[PDB]
């Protein structure tokens, strides 16, 4: 089958193929090379991501998604077309049905854009599923039962908090905080506290190697950047402790969103959640200590889903199947 489900992410795009499972997982990045005043797609995916902050004059690496939704519809369509062609079975001659996730707080305008974009990229039919519903399905929560389940999907562009019951949404919210904001927080910390300018690739490395939702000093790494006062290369050693300082603001927004969700939840469902806890999915769920930070501020158990990067795609795939 060429029918597919797409986790169209701010940072990463995953495709689940009907009958096969997850068949693609690539950064949501497009490189355009400017030849003859006109722009030509140079690369898509991991190769393009490797170019960020390192492009020469006639090249640019672009992320066409922002805050969980399509920003640059022309480039996003090229991206989607590329990914779909990549996984396409050449024995199939029928345009695919496509399920695509969308942030629960996405505007009417933003939802229309995802639909139009997938159609423009070849889909014969597009169905939208709410991200936190997909995430909860993918994480294996009992969303069809008469019981309250809470999921928190921390993506690249948004954090989706939802309470699900009986195959529906009891409460949902998209918060504009996620992997990108955390990277931006790290960039800002380095500039303000260490007079050092770093690029996104370095911030990503910091986040991944020593990033944490709470102080441990802990381990340290050495990072390079531009000394802001002298304009020359400079190296600084940064600890998990310092990474926690840097991430404090976005981590706090996530924790607050969870508490706001709990407050909004009816008593019987809220009690179900108190019993089984909160489920974390998405790239952000891998942030060391985030589960414990949420646990300590809410007093509720917190679990990280199996394969948290893949939960939304698995859930979309389940609905496709």
Author numbering: 10 to 225, 229 to 333
Original authors' sentences:
Deleting the N-terminal amphipathic helix and mutating the residues in the hydrophobic loop make the protein (ΔCcMreBdh) less prone to aggregation. In contrast, the crystals of Caulobacter MreB contain doublets that, remarkably, crystallised in an antiparallel arrangement. Although the resolution is low, the entire double protofilament structure of ΔCcMreBdh fits nicely into the 2D averaged EM images with a longitudinal subunit repeat of 5.1 nm and the widths of the doublet encompassing 6.5 nm. (C) Scaled double protofilament from the ΔCcMreBh crystal structure (d_e) was positioned into the EM density obtained from the 2D averaging. Once MreB is in the polymeric state, the presence or absence of nucleotide has very little effect on the overall structure, which is presumably stabilised by inter- and intra-protofilament contacts. The antiparallel arrangement of protofilaments of C. crescentus MreB as revealed by the crystal structure and by EM is unprecedented within the actin family of proteins. It ensures that the amphipathic helix of both protofilaments can bind to the membrane and that both protofilaments are able to interact with bitopic proteins, such as RodZ.
